[PDB]
Design an enzyme around this catalytic site. Structure first.
Site, PDB file in Angstrom:
ATOM      1  N   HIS A 115       1.144  -0.786  -0.464  1.00 46.52           N
ATOM      2  CA  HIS A 115       0.399   0.044  -0.323  1.00 46.52           C
ATOM      3  C   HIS A 115       0.943   1.950  -0.102  1.00 46.52           C
ATOM      4  CE1 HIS A 115      -3.964  -2.652   0.751  1.00 46.52           C
ATOM      5  NE2 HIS A 115      -3.144  -3.002   2.273  1.00 46.52           N
ATOM      6  N   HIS A 124      -2.332  -2.534   8.480  1.00 45.62           N
ATOM      7  CA  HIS A 124      -3.888  -2.519   7.636  1.00 45.62           C
ATOM      8  C   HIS A 124      -4.183  -1.170   7.016  1.00 45.62           C
ATOM      9  CE1 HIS A 124      -8.381  -4.080   6.702  1.00 45.62           C
ATOM     10  NE2 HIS A 124      -7.758  -3.009   7.275  1.00 45.62           N
TER      11      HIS A 124
END
Length: 134
Positions: free
Chosen positions: A16, A129
């Site tokens: 990410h 996350h």
């Protein structure tokens, strides 16, 4: 599955964090090559890791998407990003998964944890996350 050589935060960064990601079809190969599955959807935040670790100090909130987690934090700013959607589930091989590229500039939400012993001591708390973008 997360490759053992990576902390949760390092795996979060592989998946990410990329200021200059290649086209989704290419960018997704590094992620996909590890799990022998093509991820259905994935978002690359076009920023650096330290900025996302900063988000961890914002108000602690329930993760809006993955509501089993309580350790999420919403960014206070928009970041540029590259979102990737798998086009061809059923691709015979990992290298033949193809993705549609969807650039954008959004706020994001991360879940955070105290750092792994293998994480840089620069970040007592790390993102682990990507919950969502908006």
């Amino acid at each position: 599955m997360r490759p053992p050589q990576f902390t949760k935060a390092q795996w979060f960064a592989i998946q990410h964090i990329n200021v200059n990601p290649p086209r989704c079809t290419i960018a997704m190969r590094v992620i996909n090559n590890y799990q022998r599955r093509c991820k259905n959807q994935n978002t690359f935040l076009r920023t650096t890791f330290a900025y996302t670790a900063n988000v961890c100090r914002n108000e602690r909130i329930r993760c809006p998407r993955n509501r089993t987690l309580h350790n999420c934090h919403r960014s206070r700013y928009r970041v540029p990003l590259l979102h990737c959607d798998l086009i061809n589930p059923g691709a015979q091989n990992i290298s033949t998964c193809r993705y549609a590229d969807r650039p954008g500039r959004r706020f994001y939400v991360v879940a955070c944890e105290s750092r792994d012993p293998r994480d840089s001591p620069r970040y007592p708390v790390v993102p682990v996350h990507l919950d969502t973008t908006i």
